[PDB]
Design an enzyme around this catalytic site. Structure first.
Site, mmCIF file in Angstrom:
data_model
loop_
_atom_site.group_PDB
_atom_site.id
_atom_site.type_symbol
_atom_site.label_atom_id
_atom_site.label_comp_id
_atom_site.label_asym_id
_atom_site.label_seq_id
_atom_site.Cartn_x
_atom_site.Cartn_y
_atom_site.Cartn_z
ATOM 1 N N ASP A 131 0.817 -1.179 0.000
ATOM 2 C CA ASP A 131 0.000 0.000 0.000
ATOM 3 C C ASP A 131 0.841 1.214 0.000
ATOM 4 O O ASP A 131 0.538 2.190 0.680
ATOM 5 C CB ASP A 131 -0.896 -0.046 1.211
ATOM 6 N N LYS A 133 2.379 4.624 -0.887
ATOM 7 C CA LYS A 133 1.851 5.856 -1.460
ATOM 8 C C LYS A 133 2.406 7.062 -0.724
ATOM 9 O O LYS A 133 3.088 6.902 0.292
ATOM 10 C CB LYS A 133 0.343 5.850 -1.424
#
Ligand SMILES: CC(C)(O)Cn1nc(-c2ccc3cc(OC4CC4)ccc3c2)c2c(N)ncnc21
Length: 464
Positions: A131, A133
């Site tokens: 994940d 980011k």
């Protein structure tokens, strides 16, 4: 078993992240400050078993790399997991980047080299982020030269992500296509990094669209382009690394480790060989637009969420106080106010800042002091509740106004319906739905709203 709050006291909330709140905490003996991610077992389901989680935790505690958040301790009680890590004070990378007026491929390569260095290390130890980011990139401190610290390495494997939009804003842009289809490995982190790099050099996501699902449709096809005018200013070398990071089939995608050796990283991270260093002016401005957009959408969703919570909690608290009111006179003493408020927390459990009885007593005391002027013994439960609930609202409404002001960069005082479309698309509020709402707030409007109008729109969009 060790009890978290025997060792740490909560100081204040740092923010809200993936899987839960992060609280600044302090060791009650040594004074060491730490950032504790509190994961609510009820809101966040486990994917793995306890055996597997504890092994990963035990490993994570032993790993040390300058670009990875350090995990110190791990606790579990009935209702939560508490992940105790080092606190960093430099904020999110992109919020720092947009404060610059100058930004070059050299700056981007410094940044990405750190990220790749952290990723490479974690992959050696068979931990995947998944994940990755820009939110997950923090700066160690507020300095200009601050190192990057990647947060949340490893959690995705053990916890199932929220399906609430307020929690997945700006997730779609960065996810590797193989993650969508279910068969993925550590190469998904290279892809995510490649997306972040594309953004650093152009200020636009390579995969973009009007809502979450259009973004995903673009990701899954995997096609992107360099035909934006601002790529003409960018080295061929950088584009080459990008193509290799954004390679569709994972077995063909560059490894993190190899990315570190790529000509582009080798060339632009030499602290002195700045042979051509133009400043990527368009990029920085696109990133500032991008960032302001993301932050306003986020703030809108948390505003609506807070307003829904305060409906819930106001009613529940009133019913708890009502039943405690044996007199029927509408008055209660301090201990009872504390007891019902704890009974509320007993039920609610969305309030990681209230980590012990000591936290509750002091919130109640903030309110009893805030009751302006004080008569002691007999307190009007009605007004308490008004003010106790009216904290959080404005705290999350302050951020709304701040975010509106920040988005309104030309200080025009208003947002155009073009901009609304962009914001609501990012927030995943259906198009037909928000215009119907506008039409009802201001029947005469001419394609723009001021802050108050926008706010009124959000209220209507959360059933008020
Ligand atoms: C918006 C926020 C609240 O997430 C910002 N935030 N979030 C964190 C943060 C984010 C994730 C964490 C995760 C933890 O478990 C380790 C990563 C696996 C422990 C502490 C963690 C702390 C943070 C920090 N350490 N220092 C300063 N600000 C921080």
């Amino acid at each position: 078993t060790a009890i978290f709050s025997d060792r740490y006291k909560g100081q204040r909330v740092l923010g809200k992240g993936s899987f839960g709140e992060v609280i600044l905490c302090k060791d009650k003996i040594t004074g060491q400050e730490c950032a504790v991610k509190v994961i609510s077992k009820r809101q966040v389901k486990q994917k793995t078993d306890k055996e597997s989680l504890l092994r990963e935790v035990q490993l994570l505690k032993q790993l040390d790399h300058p670009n990875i958040m350090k995990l110190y301790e791990f606790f579990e009680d009935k209702g939560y997991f508490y992940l105790v890590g080092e606190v960093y004070t430099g904020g999110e990378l992109f919020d720092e980047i947009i404060s610059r007026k100058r930004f070059s491929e050299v700056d981007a390569a410094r940044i990405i080299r750190q990220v790749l260095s952290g990723i490479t290390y974690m992959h050696k130890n068979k931990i995947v982020h998944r994940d990755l980011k820009p939110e997950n990139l923090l700066l160690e401190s507020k300095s200009k030269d601050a190192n990057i610290r990647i947060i949340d390495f490893g959690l995705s494997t053990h916890f199932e992500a929220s399906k609430k939009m307020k929690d997945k804003i700006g997730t779609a842009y960065y996810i590797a296509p193989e993650v969508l289809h279910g068969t993925y490995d550590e190469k998904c982190d290279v892809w995510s990094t490649g997306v972040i790099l594309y953004i650093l050099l152009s200020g636009c996501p390579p995969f973009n669209g009007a809502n979450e699902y259009d973004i995903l449709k673009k990701v899954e096809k995997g096609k992107y382009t360099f035909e934006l005018p601002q790529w003409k200013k960018v080295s061929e070398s950088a584009k080459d690394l990008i193509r290799k990071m954004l390679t569709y089939v994972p077995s063909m995608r560059i490894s993190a480790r190899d990315a570190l050796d790529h000509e582009w990283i080798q060339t632009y991270t030499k602290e002195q060989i700045s042979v051509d260093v133009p400043s990527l002016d368009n990029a920085i401005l696109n990133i500032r637009q991008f960032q302001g957009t993301q932050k306003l959408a986020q703030a809108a969703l948390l505003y609506m969420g807070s307003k829904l919570t305060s409906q819930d909690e106001t009613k529940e608290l009133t019913a708890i106080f009502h039943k405690m009111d044996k007199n029927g006179d509408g008055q209660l003493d301090r201990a009872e106010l504390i007891e019902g408020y704890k009974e509320l927390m007993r039920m609610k459990g969305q309030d990681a800042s209230m980590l012990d009885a000591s936290a509750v007593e002091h919130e109640v005391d903030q309110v009893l002091d805030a009751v302006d002027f004080d008569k002691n013994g007999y307190i009007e439960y009605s007004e308490f509740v008004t003010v106790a609930m009216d904290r959080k609202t404005l705290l999350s409404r302050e951020r709304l106004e701040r975010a509106f002001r920040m988005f309104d960069s030309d200080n025009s005082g208003k947002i155009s319906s073009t901009e609304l479309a962009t914001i609501f698309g990012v927030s995943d509020v259906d198009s037909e739905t928000w215009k119907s709402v506008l039409s009802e707030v201001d029947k005469n409007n001419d394609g723009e709203v001021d802050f108050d109008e926008f706010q009124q729109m959000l209220l209507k969009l959360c059933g008020n």
